[PDB]
Amino acid sequence: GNNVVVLGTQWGDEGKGKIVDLLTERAKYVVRYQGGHNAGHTLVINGEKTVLHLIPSGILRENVTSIIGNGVVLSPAALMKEMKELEDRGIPVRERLLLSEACPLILDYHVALDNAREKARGAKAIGTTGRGIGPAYEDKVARRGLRVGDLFDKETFAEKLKEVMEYHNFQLVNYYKAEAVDYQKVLDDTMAVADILTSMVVDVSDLLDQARQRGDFVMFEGAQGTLLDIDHGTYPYVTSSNTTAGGVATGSGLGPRYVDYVLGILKAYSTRVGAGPFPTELFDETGEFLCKQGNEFGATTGRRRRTGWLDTVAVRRAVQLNSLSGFCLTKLDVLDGLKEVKLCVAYRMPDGREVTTTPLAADDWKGVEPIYETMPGWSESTFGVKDRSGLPQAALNYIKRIEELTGVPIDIISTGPDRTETMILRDPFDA
Amino acid sequence: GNNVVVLGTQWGDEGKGKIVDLLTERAKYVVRYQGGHNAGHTLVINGEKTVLHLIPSGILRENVTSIIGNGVVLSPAALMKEMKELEDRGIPVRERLLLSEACPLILDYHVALDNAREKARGAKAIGTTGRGIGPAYEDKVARRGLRVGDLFDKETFAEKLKEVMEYHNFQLVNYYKAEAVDYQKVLDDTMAVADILTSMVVDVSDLLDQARQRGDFVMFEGAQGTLLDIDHGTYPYVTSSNTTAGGVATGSGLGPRYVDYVLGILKAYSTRVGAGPFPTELFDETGEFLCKQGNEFGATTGRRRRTGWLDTVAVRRAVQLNSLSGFCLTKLDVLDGLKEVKLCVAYRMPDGREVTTTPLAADDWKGVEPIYETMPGWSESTFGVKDRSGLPQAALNYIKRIEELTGVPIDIISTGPDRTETMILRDPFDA
Numbered sequence: 014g015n016n017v018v019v020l021g022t023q024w025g026d027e028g029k030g031k032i033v034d035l036l037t038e039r040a041k042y043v044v045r046y047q048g049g050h051n052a053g054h055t056l057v058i059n060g061e062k063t064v065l066h067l068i069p070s071g072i073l074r075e076n077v078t079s080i081i082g083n084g085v086v087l088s089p090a091a092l093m094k095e096m097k098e099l100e101d102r103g104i105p106v107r108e109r110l111l112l113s114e115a116c117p118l119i120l121d122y123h124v125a126l127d128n129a130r131e132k133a134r135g136a137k138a139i140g141t142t143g144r145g146i147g148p149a150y151e152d153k154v155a156r157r158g159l160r161v162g163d164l165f166d167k168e169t170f171a172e173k174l175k176e177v178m179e180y181h182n183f184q185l186v187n188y189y190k191a192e193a194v195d196y197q198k199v200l201d202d203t204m205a206v207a208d209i210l211t212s213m214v215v216d217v218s219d220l221l222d223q224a225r226q227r228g229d230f231v232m233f234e235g236a237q238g239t240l241l242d243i244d245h246g247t248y249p250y251v252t253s254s255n256t257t258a259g260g261v262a263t264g265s266g267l268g269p270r271y272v273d274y275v276l277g278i279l280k281a282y283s284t285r286v287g288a289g290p291f292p293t294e295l296f297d298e299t300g301e302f303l304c305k306q307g308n309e310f311g312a313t314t315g316r317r318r319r320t321g322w323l324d325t326v327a328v329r330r331a332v333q334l335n336s337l338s339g340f341c342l343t344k345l346d347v348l349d350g351l352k353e354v355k356l357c358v359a360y361r362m363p364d365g366r367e368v369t370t371t372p373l374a375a376d377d378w379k380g381v382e383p384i385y386e387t388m389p390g391w392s393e394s395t396f397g398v399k400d401r402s403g404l405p406q407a408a409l410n411y412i413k414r415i416e417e418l419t420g421v422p423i424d425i426i427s428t429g430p431d432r433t434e435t436m437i438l439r440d441p442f443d444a
Numbered sequence: 445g446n447n448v449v450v451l452g453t454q455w456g457d458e459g460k461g462k463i464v465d466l467l468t469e470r471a472k473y474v475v476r477y478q479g480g481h482n483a484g485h486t487l488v489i490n491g492e493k494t495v496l497h498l499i500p501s502g503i504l505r506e507n508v509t510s511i512i513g514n515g516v517v518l519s520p521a522a523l524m525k526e527m528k529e530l531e532d533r534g535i536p537v538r539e540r541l542l543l544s545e546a547c548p549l550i551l552d553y554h555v556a557l558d559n560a561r562e563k564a565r566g567a568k569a570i571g572t573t574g575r576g577i578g579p580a581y582e583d584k585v586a587r588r589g590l591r592v593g594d595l596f597d598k599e600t601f602a603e604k605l606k607e608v609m610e611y612h613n614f615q616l617v618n619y620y621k622a623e624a625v626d627y628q629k630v631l632d633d634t635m636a637v638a639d640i641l642t643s644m645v646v647d648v649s650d651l652l653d654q655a656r657q658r659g660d661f662v663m664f665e666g667a668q669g670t671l672l673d674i675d676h677g678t679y680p681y682v683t684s685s686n687t688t689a690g691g692v693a694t695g696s697g698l699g700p701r702y703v704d705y706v707l708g709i710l711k712a713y714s715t716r717v718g719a720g721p722f723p724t725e726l727f728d729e730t731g732e733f734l735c736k737q738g739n740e741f742g743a744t745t746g747r748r749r750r751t752g753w754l755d756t757v758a759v760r761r762a763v764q765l766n767s768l769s770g771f772c773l774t775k776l777d778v779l780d781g782l783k784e785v786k787l788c789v790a791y792r793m794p795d796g797r798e799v800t801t802t803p804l805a806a807d808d809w810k811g812v813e814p815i816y817e818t819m820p821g822w823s824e825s826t827f828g829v830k831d832r833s834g835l836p837q838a839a840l841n842y843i844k845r846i847e848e849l850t851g852v853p854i855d856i857i858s859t860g861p862d863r864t865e866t867m868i869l870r871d872p873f874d875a
């Protein structure tokens with residue numbers, strides 16, 4: 014293990030932040046490779062809780078350097094605010110954060126377009142986090158968007174900005190019948206922050222090629238989760254970047270032959286935020302329980318999380334897309350006390366077919382019914398348990414069964430939100 | 445070597461088709477993972493020449509099955525026409541081609557938008573192949589585009605199509621002041637072809653996971669070339685998909701840990717079609733010669749290829765982005781007879797700095813001057829040479845030097861356009 018990737022196996026919310034922090038004790042670098050300032054990675058260190066959206070989760074560690082790869086659509090505003098919070102708390106953010114000059118820039122008109130498209134989708138709305146992420150990526154593949162490097166030339170910057178905003182404001186005002194966005198506002202706002210950004214630029218592909226030669230340990234930190242991947246997820250209820258392990262190469266520039274171990278963060282039950290298929294969703298007292306003990310309330314309106322049983326058919330898809338090496342089970346404790354726990358092992362098709370493979374497009378997920386395997390729960394607390402011996406036999410069997418159905422071993426078990434409450438059965442760095 | 449990727453190291457036109465055909469003698473599968481019907485992969489078998497744009501280059505082989513992965517933006521029209529040509533020639537295309545239901549569909553309004561945006565860019569035009577590739581990808585990341593799977597429900601299909609065309613025709617007619625696109629035309633055209641498409645659908649990620657278990661040999665066929673990659677290329681003079689090896693995972697669904705060998709196709713001199721930086725471009729009699737002996741005239745207007753000396757600084761960037769394993773030198777014969785051959789080994793920056801690393805954004809490539817290494821040419825013919833011994837010492841030294849500067853070995857040497865005229869020093873499948 015030299016290059017270890019950390020990604021979510023489901024639809025997000027599996028607890029990726031804690032595991033990154035925890036493991037970066039040994040890493041020289043942590044790299045974000047996709048998404049935007051919509052991560053929501055929570056860190057609970059000896060009591061204090063930090064929530065990071067853009068800046069990588071290795072930022073609290075002293076020996077590590079954090080980088081934001083070219084796949085990340087970056088917002089100067091969000092970056093500034095997150096830098097301020099961390100500096101206020103005493104974290105010398107400026108001495109250990111580096112970024113790629115190829116990062117697309119997210120700006121006002123993007124959030125504006127994001128709201129616009131959602132409002133317009135009506136009942137077929139996606140459930141976007143509202144941060145203008147989708148539109149920013151859209152600009153990029155269309156080769157019309159700006160990038161951090163564009164900020165080297167203040168003069169040319171203005172010209173480009175002007176041509177872009179002209180096009181967008183048109184669709185806003187004329188098609189969405191929405192407010193236009195002030196050019197001078199954006200321009201001035203960006204210029205103000207412009208010099209903190211460029212001061213931090215670095216050639217990531219080259220830096221990562223060097224680390225590979227020096228034999229440094231590198232940790233990549235994915236956000237969102239596998240089934241929200243733009244290509245392989247439950248399209249269109251999906252995010253606009255590749256969340257799967259392939260996005261590591263594409264979004265940081267490290268050759269695909271150098272990924273050594275891929276850790277899939279697996280929540281003990283399922284969740285989803287926003288619209289979209291969800292075969293094992295619960296609507297009863299158990300659904301209620303998981304939400305409450307899981308503390309799945311959310312950020313704001315519409316950001317309260319949907320809950321359900323673990324879906325072994327969907328996790329199995331995640332296994333192949335990412336060539337997972339091991340899982341990290343999080344929140345087993347939320348299941349504590351239930352009479353019996355369940356887990357989907359196959360899907361019953363509308364026509365009676367029983368399959369073990371997930372459908373591709375949301376429309377095909379429409380009438381699938383989960384086929385469960387029921388097993389006894391456990392009465393004792395598993396929260397904070399630091400040793401395997403302290404886990405009830407019924408809890409161990411649930412674990413054993415996930416390993417059997419998926420073919421992948423559970424290498425780490427998180428028993429609490431604190432860095433200390435964890436069982437590392439196998440260090441990815443030592444594999 | 446179980447999983448071998450074949451991609452272009454430069455700006456395209458390196459001769460990828462021949463090498464795919466050649467090597468698929470042993471492969472069970474060949475997979476396209478990006479781009480559209482704009483490949484232009486030429487196959488010269490015992491005299492007959494085939495040019496394929498969409499269908500993979502393993503289509504002429506009897507034992508192989510060709511697949512078009514989810515990364516490929518697909519056009520039913522182009523697919524139909526290419527299927528007809530091949531069937532006419534006697535190739536049973538329908539028995540060995542499979543596609544992914546996640547492939548975005550390119551349709552009329554896309555080509556229409558492509559022309560529109562180019563016409564509008566004026567002097568900063570990109571040089572698009574005009575096939576509506578960029579707009580199709582744009583629709584996809586914005587989650588508004590259609591996919592082959594959408595064709596399962598003829599009813600819903602119409603609804604979606606209608607909502608999409610409504611939005612696009614608006615920007616066309618109202619913003620680009622261009623012709624609107626006929627909804628019923630598109631609709632009927634697609635419905636006609638609709639049943640040949642769905643009959644060929646397959647779950648590629650699952651099929652590739654299976655091949656991995658059976659130990660089958662798989663060949664992935666990239667189109668375009670490394671420096672045209674949307675993320676790491678010379679943006680915006682670039683294509684809209686990832687051409688680098690990372691696009692294999694993202695565009696076919698094979699886990700990144702399963703890529704076994706990456707073959708970089710290296711043309712002995714450089715070329716580029718369309719706008720964009722090009723440090724070693726030639727404007728003299730040599731430029732003229734390379735174009736003429738190389739037969740770099742092209743497809744149509746604007747499709748005549750620019751020529752220049754081999755750029756070892758740019759190739760070195762390709763090496764890291766793709767974790768290349770070996771190169772395949774093509775067209776050494778075009779250099780035959782020149783007095784002396786050159787090769788860029790560093791770049792002189794505007795400010796006098798000498799670097800060995802390529803700049804990222806086109807604007808930074810602006811004032812770079814190549815720093816060459818000159819060496820003697822060779823008078824004898826190398827065309828058709830099947831054995832290393834038959835290569836002049838001066839030609840061997842040119843080869844040796846590419847290996848020294850890049851760190852990667854040249855495993856195959858193509859000495860002619862026919863499958864037979866090749867020197868395989870190391871089979872990727874046996875590595």
Ligand SMILES: Nc1ncnc2c1ncn2[C@@H]1O[C@H](COP(=O)(O)O)[C@@H](O)[C@H]1O
Nearest residue numbers: 025051052140141142143251252286287
């Ligand atoms: N951090 C996240 N956790 C869970 N789902 C997310 C997250 N951010 C984005 N998504 C989901 O991805 C979809 C589109 O979001 P966006 O990335 O804002 O376009 C919605 O289903 C979002 O809820």
Ligand SMILES: Nc1ncnc2c1ncn2[C@@H]1O[C@H](COP(=O)(O)O)[C@@H](O)[C@H]1O
Nearest residue numbers: 456482483571572573574682683717718
């Ligand atoms: N097969 C190809 N060979 C060379 N360059 C290509 C090829 N197809 C696309 N490009 C270039 O990619 C840019 C955008 O093309 P497009 O893929 O049509 O958007 C232009 O520089 C094209 O010349």
